[PDB]
């Protein structure tokens, strides 16, 4: 129940690659890591590797330098009914969606009885994942989905200016008015 050597011996090798500039090998390693069968003990590691892949996959390459995971530049999930990634946006959005779906479960519900570290960490993770989602979705101009996703994350917000302001500004773009007016008043 103690993962101690896999994470080090694998991540630090492609960390050295990043220090040297071997981006393709690291991307392949991340892909073969994520395409493997899920492990319940390493769900947090899956979260971390997915976030690290999503952070770099939007600001480190170009359109013509993209390749599908099924070709070169134990058990593995396969089949013909699966959704094969096509472009960077599709797989990035899928990774962000699954990360958000799993990260809602592990929320500490903003307990604040006497301790605050866990809630602060959870809030930071939620903020960064939703920021990545909104910056990914903004460039294509699908504002209704963005508004719905922001409305989904309103459970955490109690005394936060940033989330309320982002939701209010997203509401106006879609077209709705009355809810936008009320959130603006708040």
């Amino acid at each position: 129940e103690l993962g101690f050597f896999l994470e080090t011996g694998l991540q630090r090798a492609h960390v050295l690659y990043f220090k040297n500039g071997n981006l393709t090998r690291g991307v392949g390693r991340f892909r073969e890591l994520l395409r493997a069968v899920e492990t319940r003990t390493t769900q947090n590691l899956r979260m971390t590797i997915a976030r690290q892949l999503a952070e770099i996959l939007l600001r480190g390459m170009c359109e013509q330098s993209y390749w599908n995971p099924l070709e070169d530049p134990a058990r593995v999930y396969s089949g013909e009914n699966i959704f094969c990634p096509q472009e960077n946006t599709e797989e990035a959005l899928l990774l962000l969606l699954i990360s958000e779906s799993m990260a809602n479960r592990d929320a500490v519900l903003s307990r604040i009885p006497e301790h605050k570290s866990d809630r602060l960490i959870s809030l930071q993770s939620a903020s960064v994942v939703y920021d990545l989602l909104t910056i990914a979705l903004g460039r294509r101009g699908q504002y209704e989905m963005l508004s719905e996703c922001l409305e989904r994350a309103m459970k955490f917000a109690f005394e936060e200016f940033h989330l309320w302001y982002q939701f209010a500004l997203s509401l106006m773009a879609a077209g709705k008015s009355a809810r936008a007016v009320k959130v603006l008043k708040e």
Partner: protein, 589 residues
């Protein structure tokens, strides 16, 4: 295409006719409570209205849900206000709930529409979607507190809304609703209530004093106190240690002075017990009372809206009983905010205080809250009923402070002095029945008696003998000693005592015959009061539900089911009037 407009007008004509018939029936029901065959109106119109009611009362489940769709197409407000005009069918509620779930943004009137959306499922606790309650206007505090009770499973959004609604009221209302707030901590698997309590105590000043005084008593379970509850006792200890010490400066000095003065004035009862009955106990009590000095800035706990001036050092008089004594005070009435601001810098009458040791003072507090709410309802509606809500505050396990009504006159003492009926007493006191003062005294007696009988029937209060009724100088009657209620019944639940106590002398006061005009006045006043008090069931149910876990002997499990039944929430006005008239006369001889 004339058919479209034809049906378009016919449907609305039918709906308007139904609504007008219902309104006319309600108004004519309110006109005269009794049948009153002497009074009469046009016959053909009444017959037509009755025929239309009989015709439209036979509709099935269909052709009635469609009416809700038409009403919604007309205006959402009319559709929302539809179940208020009671229809004996549950399909209307389901259809309204479905429609409001499909579009919640069309309605923003909180007092009624909020309950059609909040409870997605009563106890199922599923489907957490589309619930955006962060825009509704504030509602009454009783509705907000309902989300922390056993009625609804916990949820972050409901708790957040309940916290939001409570933070938009003046401090006096929160002071009035103090006892229910602390009990919410038991079912508070969350902790928003704790943060709210800390913020409120930091903001106001008297609220902190009320909180500490209330919470100091509730840590234990027994009257004397030797067993802390295993549920929230440690949390209460942590809270009481946290809140104190945080305050500093003039507020700390004022709190210290008030608590020191109260302790000095309280230890006398403990000191005086070892001395037996006699003049020695009285003189020792007088000396102990003279020992204490008057400290400016203090205030009585039972009346936080007045400032004490001095102490009468000769009013000490212990009563029979445990060493409870009595004292008198000279007080000045200023207010609340002025008192609060004057307590950090340094119209006069007399008051009497009664202290008790070793007795519980919570059921009386709940009864007083209910009585005050009923008095507010009666004053708002515009009727003429009289009730006297004497204040009472508990401050220690088994110890509390109870106010005394001015010019106390016990019925038992008067009966011992006279050993005759009250009719002779009030004939001697005021004069013959033909004088002017006798009529006013009788009118005040009717005013008090009707309201008190209605309250006694409604709350199911037992153990009402001649030694508890109180008579004032004007002629009103006031009840006291509400220890037994709901289910508790001295004697072994024998039950031969009637719901309303009606002896022969009190009947003879109002003429002694059921056909007398004052008797009709009393009957119509009772019927009108019962009709007026009905539409406030939810607040009473919410207030009484939250105090079940305290483990008082009165509660036994089936209180809510029986209490909700006595309001008859599925009957029309005329049927309810007939029911109350039948139940009133059943207790007469």
């Amino acid at each position: 295409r004339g058919s479209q407009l034809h049906k378009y007008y016919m449907k609305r004509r039918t709906l308007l006719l139904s609504l007008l018939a219902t309104e006319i029936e309600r108004l004519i029901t309110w006109y005269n409570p009794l049948s009153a065959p002497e009074l009469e109106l046009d016959q053909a119109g009444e017959n037509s209205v009755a025929n239309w009611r009989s015709k439209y009362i036979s509709l099935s489940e269909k052709q009635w849900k469609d009416n809700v769709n038409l009403a919604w197409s007309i205006s959402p407000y009319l559709a929302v206000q539809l179940p208020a005009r009671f229809k004996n069918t549950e399909a209307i509620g389901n259809e309204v709930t479905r429609l409001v779930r499909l579009d919640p943004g069309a309605v923003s009137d909180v007092p009624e529409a909020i309950k059609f959306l909040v409870t997605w499922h009563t106890i199922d606790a599923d489907a957490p979607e589309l619930s955006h309650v962060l825009c509704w206007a504030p509602t009454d505090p009783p509705t907000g507190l309902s989300y922390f009770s056993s009625m609804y499973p916990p949820h972050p959004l409901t708790a957040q809304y309940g916290v939001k609604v409570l933070r938009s009221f003046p401090p006096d209302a929160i002071l009035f609703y103090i006892p229910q707030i602390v009990q919410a901590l038991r079912y508070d698997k969350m902790g928003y209530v704790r943060e709210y309590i800390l913020w409120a105590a930091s903001k106001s000043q008297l609220l902190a004093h009320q909180f500490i005084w209330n919470m100091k008593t509730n840590i234990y379970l027994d009257e004397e106190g030797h067993q802390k509850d295993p549920d929230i006792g440690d949390l209460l200890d942590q809270l009481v240690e946290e809140i104190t010490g945080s305050l500093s400066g003039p507020a700390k000095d004022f709190y210290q002075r008030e608590f020191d003065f109260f302790n000095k004035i309280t230890n006398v009862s403990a000191i005086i017990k070892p001395y037996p009955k006699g003049d020695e106990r009285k003189k020792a009590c007088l000396s102990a009372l003279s020992e204490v000095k008057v400290q400016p800035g203090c205030y009585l706990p039972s009346n936080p809206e007045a400032i004490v001036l001095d102490i009468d050092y000769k009013s000490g008089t212990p009563m029979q009983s445990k060493a409870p004594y009595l004292a008198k005070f000279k007080v000045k009435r200023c207010g609340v905010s002025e008192l609060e601001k004057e307590g950090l810098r340094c119209k006069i009458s007399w008051q009497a205080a009664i202290f008790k040791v070793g007795d519980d003072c919570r059921q009386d507090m709940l009864a007083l809250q209910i009585i005050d709410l009923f008095k507010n309802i009666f004053q708002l509606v515009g009727l003429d009923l009289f009730v006297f809500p004497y204040r009472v505050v508990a401050t220690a396990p088994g110890c509390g402070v109870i106010e005394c009504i001015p010019d106390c006159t016990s019925r038992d003492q008067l009966g011992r002095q006279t050993d005759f009926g009250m009719y002779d007493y009030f004939t001697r006191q005021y004069g013959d029945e033909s004088t002017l003062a006798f009529q006013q005294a009788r009118y005040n007696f009717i005013r008090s008696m009707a309201a008190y009988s209605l309250l006694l029937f409604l709350l199911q209060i037992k153990d009402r003998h001649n030694g508890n009724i109180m008579l004032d100088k004007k002629g009103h009657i006031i009840h006291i000693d509400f220890g037994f209620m709901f289910e508790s019944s001295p004697g072994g639940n024998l039950g031969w005592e009637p719901d309303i106590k009606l002896t022969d002398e009190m009947v003879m006061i109002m003429g002694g015959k059921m056909e007398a005009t004052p008797f009709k006045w009393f009957m119509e006043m009772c019927v009108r009061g019962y009709l007026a008090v009905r539409p406030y069931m939810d607040a009473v149910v919410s207030l009484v539900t939250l105090m079940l876990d305290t483990g008082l002997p009165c509660f036994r499990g089936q209180t809510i089911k029986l209490l909700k039944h006595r309001f008859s929430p599925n009957m029309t006005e005329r049927e309810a009037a007939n029911f109350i008239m039948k139940v009133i006369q059943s207790c007469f001889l």
